[model samples]
Target: LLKYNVGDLVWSKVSGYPWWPCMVSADPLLHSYTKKSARQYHVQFFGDAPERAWIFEKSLVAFEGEGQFEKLCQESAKQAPTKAEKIKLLKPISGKLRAQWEMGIVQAEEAASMSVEERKAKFTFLY
Candidate 1:
């Protein structure tokens, strides 16, 4: 919903990692931002980068292009459901899946923040 065209400059800050540059290659899905409390923008990179496409939260990114990205963010924010609606939507999920997904986000944040040396050190013991 954020106003974006093909070939726009974007940056993503996924919790633990530094901001990364990317290009907008497609439009975002409706309600994409409302479903997550994390970042709101989604994009493709200018070149071959791992995980070329991703959804990012508004707080986690900035833009170097025109106002399109901002427009999308604003629109998505407006579309987000109220607290009650979110609770109702998730009620069908079993408790275990809910717990696992929540924990997964926490682990992802930790991994993102890890330095290369830190990651190597942590994993070296595994092997």
Candidate 2:
């Protein structure tokens, strides 16, 4: 896995999207990045607004819309983590999810051409 932390922006795997802005906001391990090593994802096509893109990767909280994303906060919060510590943490789950994502990259490269609407969206996002 790529070395990413909570709230860190990173690339995505969607065929229609270019860069995948991301945050280390999810972990099956439930330790957030408190484990000091983890991953995150939150991107929107080939776009830029770095000032708006910067998301803090600690406590792993999303400030305003925090509670609505309560499950993510569970991923952020301290709960039921150490219980697994006795036996062990999952470290992760569904390793093949990455494989599914990788398939998107290959499929994108293999495409013959883009549809007119897709081309328009690309132009709109890029410039």
Candidate 3:
């Protein structure tokens, strides 16, 4: 049996960051790069900013929002993680996520800054 199911709400901590309220977007699976079997959940952080991360089972806290989220600050203030820890805490896990992140950023910026119709004139295809 699994500890968490898809769409379950939980608090996710990535050490240096505050306890973020997130939901399991997908089922847990054994991480590909680990030496041994290690299950990771695909979570999407909500409330403030939209973010996606592959978090391990351990770092999650089972609890059941703005007031709940405000209470999270109390924990963050008490622990106050060291600056050095931030680097590893925010390490990128899924290469797939990174690729999408990069491409999305590029696409969004290009769409705003470049004229699509004018640019299309120079690169017409026979399709």
Candidate 4:
């Protein structure tokens, strides 16, 4: 998650109106998800943009002018939680309590063999 401080000025990357300079007004809030958890923030824009907004880490930056999200997933340099602390955070993933972390097992599930894509016939479009 992007590190943000209240009263800091920043430009959003996905702020509905083409992201511009904004004044952060609150501490970030952690919102959970099935695969992992992340943070969202609230802010107030300067001008020609929404006065107030609540949204993405994808929004934290000074108008770096859009790039691949993969590039933005840089290593965090701050203090990290202990292994035990991490395990405690993962209370229920896919209905199972996580005991520890592992590689290649997303949410303690079996792996697929298709190199990230399901078999061609396995997908259908609602469209």
Candidate 5:
């Protein structure tokens, strides 16, 4: 559970885009139907630019702004014993978690020297 408030600076790593910095404008929540077993994060990039907003999975993002987002996440993980409890705590801060996850994925992709599309195709053939 990464806690982030409005106006908190953060970075977002999109699949095909560079890491972009934005402020937290809304709280995130888990969507039941879109991706089962995953939380969805809603974020706004560029002040007054709601059109640039997008939703990401909680497993795809990281926090880089001022605050204790990472510390909160670690603490919550230590305190939560069950999946449901973790999810409940994470619901309010899904955006930060999503950002961290995305950053991690981007780093992994870069290290592997393969685009996500390429990796998907490779795995597709293996399966």
Candidate 6:
């Protein structure tokens, strides 16, 4: 079943905007048969280039206005300084590879009692 309803605030991806916020303008079910995904949402995006577009449910996330997106991009490097470089140099062929790369980092950082330096040290050898 669909998780969002019309008029709800949600975050969706735009070409360069990435995690921008938008309002669910119409019923999630209205666009169901238009595509095979069966869970597309009709959303009205906000910001400088505001417009309406039908985005897949997978791309929509809860709109938490705390600026998490911007902070994570910079914070990732602040601690694991080489993390940003690792992602660029390792060069994942597809999105799947990158997902696993970051997943491993997450496990090391939270699940293990690993320090920042240790994380970087292991990453250098592992990747």
- By lDDT, the best candidate is 3
TM-score of each: 0.31, 0.20, 0.46, 0.36, 0.32, 0.45
State which candidate, 2 or 3, has the greater lDDT. 3
Q: Which 10-residue window of candidate 3 scores lowest in summed lDDT?
A: 118-127
Superposed Cα deviation of residue 91, candidate 1 (Å):
42
> What TM-score would candidate 4 get against the native?
0.36
Model 4 lDDT tens row, 5-35: 5444455544112334454554223322111
State the lDDT of candidate 5 residue by residue for 1-48, as single tens digits: 444433333455443233444433433443221226555444444221
lDDT per residue, candidate 1, 9-76, as tens digits? 45553432223444433334452322334534445432222344555545334453333434433443
Q: How good is model 6 by TM-score? A: 0.45
Which tens-of-lDDT digit does each residue in 1-127 have in candidate 2? Answer: 5445333323332222212223333333343333345433332222223111222333223222212332432332234335453222223223534344344334333221444344323322221
Candidate 3: list runs displaced more than 4 Å. 27-35, 65-127
Query: What do the candidate models score in CA lDDT, each in turn?
Result: 0.40, 0.31, 0.50, 0.37, 0.42, 0.49
The order by descending TM-score is 3, 6, 4, 5, 1, 2
Q: Please tell me which model should have the higher TM-score, number 2 or number 5.
A: 5
The clash count for each model shown is: 10, 11, 0, 0, 10, 0
Alpha-carbon deviation at 99 in model 5, angstroms: 22
Model 4 scores worst on lDDT over the 10 consecutive residues at 99-108
Writing each residue's lDDT as its tens digit, candidate 6 over 1-127 gives 4587644556675432335455556433464321354577776655333456788887677654534545433333344435645364333324544444344334323422444355333332210
Total backbone collisions, model 6: 0
Top-TM-score candidate index: 3
State the TM-score for model 3.
0.46
